[PDB]
Amino acid sequence: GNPVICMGHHAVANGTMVKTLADDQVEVVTAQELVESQNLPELCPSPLRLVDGQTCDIINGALGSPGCDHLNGAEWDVFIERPNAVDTCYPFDVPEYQSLRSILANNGKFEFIAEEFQWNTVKQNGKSGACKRANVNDFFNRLNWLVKSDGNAYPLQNLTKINNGDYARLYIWGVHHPSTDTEQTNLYKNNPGGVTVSTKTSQTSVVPNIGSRPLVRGLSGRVSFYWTIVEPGDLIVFNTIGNLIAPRGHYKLNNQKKSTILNTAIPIGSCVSKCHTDKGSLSTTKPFQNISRIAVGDCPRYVKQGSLKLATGMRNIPE
């Protein structure tokens, strides 16, 4: 009585190290990396609709600056906003800049609707040598520079637009700031000027402010942009005794806003992926990624660790 039968298990020559609760280097036969640490050097145009702002950031695209024409009609899941975008128009600011940019990005589309504003006696379509469109003095094609009549008259403006549609409207307007008391009068005669936009449930009043400012592409003057949202059943009143950069109309707002914006220099390529970081798209099935906290789409969760190995086999004890 002398035959022998032995029960055993496999082994390989060199396994992979993993962590347990007790040990941070246990060798197992196979393991699987759970942290994606490689990204593609491009952004995937599919399956998500990506829209490239190119030379325009999303605020300039909303305003209608020169060169931003490709963004008209544009619809996006993710707006790709380039770091080297540049102002090509009248020097401006938006007091609540990030809140406006957020609203535009999230809304997911540039659908402009023209309206005619019957401005009494004032001149319209005022242009500027800071906003050249093929060397011709121009302006934000969504805005209307109103100045004096030639008879030196800027009277009180008083027009109302009623929203009876089935969607909420976004109106973007502005207030012009001259650099001396002279300019104020050679543009809007009155001094001071002032704009007051109101709805049934809200209102906003602006004082123009006049003084010396740094030279931005040849000028000291500025425009301050504001926005008003007009729900179904509400309506909007524009009142002006001077300095109004009037709107050409209103942007359409989706009831459900599901889009966003990604700021990056990464080029848009040909790959397929539903996950985008500011470093490029991720093409992965791993549950975690260490590439960027800035991530949009259907993505692994961002973590600090560069590697987390899951054991997919038993301890490796070769020989």
Binding site: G1, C6, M7, E319
Partner: protein, 172 residues
């Protein structure tokens, strides 16, 4: 692991065992052999792939979030935005660290377990015809040719055939 079979009373694994995770190595009068055990191999593979599948897809489908990079400090609101995100990241990193440690601890116990279940299965087949040598091997106290060995491996071994021979070899 908890059962003390792998890296335990089984001294090491078999690099030659390439078509299974677990198996049988024997010696009898006509020679030696190594064969994979399918059932125990499959039981371990199923449990581990099960872990992989539950893992390789929950869902984190996120679009409009918050700004996470800033050129210049702004004060109160920016501090909160940074602190929310930093808090989220630490918590998810913690989750990821713990998950892998828990999964790996368990995976090692599962595979140690399946090794022990196989040993115990064969032990029970043999009844009084064999004795545990202490290293994952049974000494079989009767002649056991290649068909006998295969009958052990495929679960058709009938201990009553050899019991008289085995008992006599064990105790005298």
């Amino acid at each position: 692991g908890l059962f003390g079979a792998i890296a335990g009373f089984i001294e090491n694994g078999w690099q030659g065992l390439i078509d299974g995770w677990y198996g049988f190595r024997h010696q009898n009068a006509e020679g030696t052999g190594t064969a994979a055990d399918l059932k125990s191999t499959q039981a371990a593979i199923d449990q581990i792939n099960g872990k992989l599948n539950r893992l390789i897809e929950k869902t984190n489908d996120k679009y409009h979030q918050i700004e996470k990079e800033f050129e210049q400090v702004e004060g109160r609101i920016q501090d909160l935005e940074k602190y929310v995100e930093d808090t989220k990241i630490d918590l998810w990193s913690y989750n990821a660290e713990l998950l892998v440690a828990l999964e790996n601890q368990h995976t090692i116990d599962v595979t140690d377990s399946e090794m022990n279940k196989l040993f115990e299965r064969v032990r029970r087949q043999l009844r009084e015809n064999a004795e545990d040598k202490g290293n994952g091997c049974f000494e079989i106290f009767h002649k056991c040719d290649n068909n006998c060995i295969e009958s052990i491996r495929n679960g058709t071994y009938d201990h009553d055939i050899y019991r008289d021979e085995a008992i006599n070899n064990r105790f005298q």
